[PDB]
Amino acid sequence: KKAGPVQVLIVKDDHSFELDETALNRILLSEAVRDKEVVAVSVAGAFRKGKSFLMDFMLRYMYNQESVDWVGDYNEPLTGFSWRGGSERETTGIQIWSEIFLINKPDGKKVAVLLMDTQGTFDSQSTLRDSATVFALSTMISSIQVYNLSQNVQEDDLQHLQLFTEYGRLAMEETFLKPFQSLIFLVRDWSFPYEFSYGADGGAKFLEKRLKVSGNQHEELQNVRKHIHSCFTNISCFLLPHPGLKVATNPNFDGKLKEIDDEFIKNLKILIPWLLSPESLDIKEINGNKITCRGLVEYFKAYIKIYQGEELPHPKSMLQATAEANNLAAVATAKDTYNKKMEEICGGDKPFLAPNDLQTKHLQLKEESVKLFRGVKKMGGEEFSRRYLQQLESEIDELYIQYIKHNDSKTIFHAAR
Amino acid sequence: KKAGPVQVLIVKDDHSFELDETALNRILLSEAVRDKEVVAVSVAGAFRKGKSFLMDFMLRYMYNQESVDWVGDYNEPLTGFSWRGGSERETTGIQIWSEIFLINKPDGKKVAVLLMDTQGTFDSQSTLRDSATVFALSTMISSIQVYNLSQNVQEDDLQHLQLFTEYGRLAMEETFLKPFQSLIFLVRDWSFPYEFSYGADGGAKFLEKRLKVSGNQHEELQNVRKHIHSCFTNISCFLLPHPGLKVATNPNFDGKLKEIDDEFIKNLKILIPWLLSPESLDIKEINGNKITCRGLVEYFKAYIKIYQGEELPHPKSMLQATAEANNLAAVATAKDTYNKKMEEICGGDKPFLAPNDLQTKHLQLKEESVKLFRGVKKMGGEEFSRRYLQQLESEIDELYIQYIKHNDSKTIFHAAR
Ligand SMILES: Nc1nc2c(ncn2[C@@H]2O[C@H](COP(=O)(O)OP(=O)(O)O)[C@@H](O)[C@H]2O)c(=O)[nH]1
Ligand SMILES: Nc1nc2c(ncn2[C@@H]2O[C@H](COP(=O)(O)OP(=O)(O)O)[C@@H](O)[C@H]2O)c(=O)[nH]1
Ligand code: ALF
Ligand code: ALF
Ligand SMILES: [Mg+2]
Ligand SMILES: [Mg+2]
């Protein structure tokens, strides 16, 4: 048929995930490609940043690799994966190109090349779990992940990457090898060529400075960086110029090269082959073993099941995760404080205490623990704390009841007039 | 001679905070302004996005408000707060303009106007606590907070804003009133005037869609929005055009209007008075009471002390907070499970168990609890879990010791040949 985009991972309105297995099998399990070792290319990152648009230039290269003018006719619209302006997301879930490219590597290996376009993270219809699942799955599956960013590499960008890739790691078999392979920090609309040049060399210098870990660097800064180094075998950076305001703002813009700034085009022609030339095609490795298209379908199915289940922790926002953490820790301290004090009163090495006195002491101790809990400043504040405080009181009462039984076993009664 | 930027909040290299009290007092405690009700304007948001640049135009408006041509001579460079290109942060901590502007409000009140320029969030030398502190403090002190965004309002931006404002709330007196007043979402380089027009009306429609809370919207989406509605009295949005590639890109660019796109200038001229015209100047209110410059210095000192201490919870990244949350919860379940099983064996209502048998049962139960803990998938893995597992085992052992004493108190010994 006509080659086209195929929706492979579907994100439902209830935030669940479906894999189109029939469609996936039709593409990767064909007699022509199934036994071929696979190269998987993905682009991922914040929504509305020209991921699909870039991927469509990648397509022109994959088809027209032989011509020096692979970049295309200057009056020809850009087609393939769906891309457009407007502030609302276009690409959802994960889609792959229906035509698998067969390329000869400089070592004589004929390999299969798969292209993946992904739903941008942090759009306004998505839970953090949605964004994390999409990003993770694309990372786990691709051998080359193009991490698409706007203008700069900010600390929050590194943190998002850490979280999303951590979510991918959780769903994977444990290994001594790094989980993933090639990672590319593609910086769109890089504005400072006078400081770091456009392209890969300026990019590399820019990334080495930004990902640098040093002795006097605060641990929080060190850790997010070390995490990224530990995840990927090869990490690079490419600085791309702004493509011009027509591309950005013009509702009629169709993707014709005649409308794009020449400096952008010059760098794009460097970028794509740098990604996709035969010598650059990273064959997918899982657990240090090269994977075929057939094998990739089997891992895709297995990973998706894990994300469909409930074994993994839910990805959470900073506020939500910190508030929970603050409350859980405070409950533990408060309860433990109660336990220690009751031990001094009716531990096994302590005498029988009259039940009315034991009750008075318990009410006092419980109250001290509640005040202790109330007094700790936590995010989410008191409202968020409510179920935790009630949990604290409910758990202290369970302990008290256990203590009542211990104390009663020492009961002394003397009859006296 | 005279006026210039003054560093008021200093962030040290060890990530501690110092207030320049002498400098603050010299400006806000002067006889001319100390007893005046105060309007405090702040710009805050991601680093390297033109906050200081914008603020310098605010300065032009503040000085030249009377002239219709306040925006300035087209050949005049932009000065005041320090602004520049390059990928490394410029503004650190918080600085204020040395000259407090005295303006008559249309109701006859003469008020004092203060401008605050802030260190951008998420730079590569800052902990999350550094950024949260800067953002929170600027929000707590300002009556008008300009939230500076690039291109769009993404879900992560709303999450950052929720966290930072929560960090501010934690340091403030309990109140029934909303903690803050005016918040402005200023979107720089808005790319879709064909969808939502440049300026406040387009901004307003875009923001009402983006901050909208509905019945069928996932709770995670609802909650970050409700939090924002709850924090601020008046929330608005302004969509600003790209100022042109020269402004973004030219190392020689000086802030001269002749180098700036006319549509940007057209919109800038609307934006500033919309923020700062006499009718718009929001008097700072804390706990529903209007504040003078004298009072503002006092709240500034009081809030900063809280951030210098350790009563507040530490802001943490998604991974760090979620990983801690996962581990704390798993320890409580695992420990609670051990406790319940031991109760069935040596609760107060249970007969004496020979210590060798009690020991065997304890080792079995502890082991079941450890496996339960190890079986729960957590961010990020065993590495992060190590201290928690050790805490779990160590806490179970404490419990066991309490049970040994309970059991010994029921000891039965019979002498027999
Ligand atoms: N500012 C800017 N806009 C771009 C660039 N590349 C593409 N665009 C525009 O970005 C918008 C969104 O493109 P799209 O590929 O659908 O974004 P996606 O959501 O990441 O897949 C379109 O209007 C493109 O014309 C770029 O490098 N810089
Ligand atoms: N793309 C873009 N660049 C801007 C805008 N305003 C200022 N700039 C440029 O942004 C850079 C950083 O300016 P600065 O005010 O120091 O950023 P800040 O660190 O957020 O305070 C300078 O190169 C300005 O020329 C804008 O609206 N859009
Ligand atoms: F906003 Al998108 F693909 F990330 F349309
Ligand atoms: F990067 Al800035 F003020 F945010 F210099
Ligand atoms: Mg897309
Ligand atoms: Mg600045």
Side-chain angles (χ1 to χ4, degrees), chain A residues 45-49 51-52 88-91 118-121:
Chain A
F47 87 117
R48 305 284 69 220
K49 306 294 198 195
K51 297 181 301 307
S52 291
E88 303 289 314
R89 72 172 184 192
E90 174 63 15
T91 315
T118 76
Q119 171 183 331
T121 62

Side-chain angles (χ1 to χ4, degrees), chain A residues 8 30 48 114 137 151 194 235 244 254 259 267 286 300 373 405:
Chain A
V8 150
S30 80
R48 305 284 69 220
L114 165 155
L137 265 172
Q151 45 202 138
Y194 51 92
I235 309 180
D254 221 357
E259 322 270 33
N267 287 274
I286 297 177
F300 214 173
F373 178 91
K405 296 188 183 90

Side-chain angles (χ1 to χ4, degrees), chain A residues 48-53 83-85 188-189 242-243 247 253:
Chain A
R48 305 284 69 220
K49 306 294 198 195
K51 297 181 301 307
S52 291
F53 174 92
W83 71 275
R84 53 146 179 90
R188 312 293 279 265
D189 305 345
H242 201 292
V247 174
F253 173 66

Side-chain angles (χ1 to χ4, degrees), chain B residues 47-48 51 89-91 118 120:
Chain B
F47 88 114
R48 305 285 67 221
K51 297 182 302 307
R89 73 173 187 193
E90 174 64 18
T91 312
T118 76

Side-chain angles (χ1 to χ4, degrees), chain A residues 49 86-87 122 128 150-151 155 160 166 192 195 209 220 249 313 318 339-340 343 377-378 380 402, chain B residues 86-88 122 128 150-151 155 160 166 170 191 194-195 209 220 318 321 339 343 377 380 398 402:
Chain A
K49 306 294 198 195
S87 55
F122 311 111
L128 186 59
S150 173
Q151 45 202 138
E155 207 50 38
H160 298 327
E166 180 58 28
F192 320 109
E195 189 187 37
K209 185 171 200 271
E220 188 187 296
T249 74
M318 283 180 292
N339 176 41
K340 263 56 182 173
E343 279 286 308
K377 280 300 210 172
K378 314 171 205 79
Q402 296 169 213
Chain B
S87 53
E88 303 291 316
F122 314 110
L128 183 61
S150 173
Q151 294 168 285
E155 209 49 38
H160 298 330
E166 182 58 27
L170 290 183
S191 300
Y194 54 90
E195 191 185 39
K209 189 182 183 190
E220 189 188 297
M318 282 180 292
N339 176 41
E343 279 289 309
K377 283 302 208 173
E398 301 182 2
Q402 295 169 218

Side-chain angles (χ1 to χ4, degrees), chain B residues 308-356:
Chain B
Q308 297 168 322
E310 293 301 317
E311 289 180 17
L312 301 193
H314 296 165
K316 295 161 201 259
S317 69
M318 282 180 292
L319 184 138
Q320 181 72 35
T322 306
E324 290 183 33
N326 299 157
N327 278 278
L328 289 166
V331 164
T333 300
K335 181 154 123 91
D336 174 79
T337 303
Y338 170 84
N339 176 41
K340 300 290 183 51
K341 280 166 185 181
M342 288 293 283
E343 279 289 309
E344 289 312 307
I345 282 200
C346 51
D349 53 354
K350 304 300 169 153
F352 174 63
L353 193 51
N356 299 144

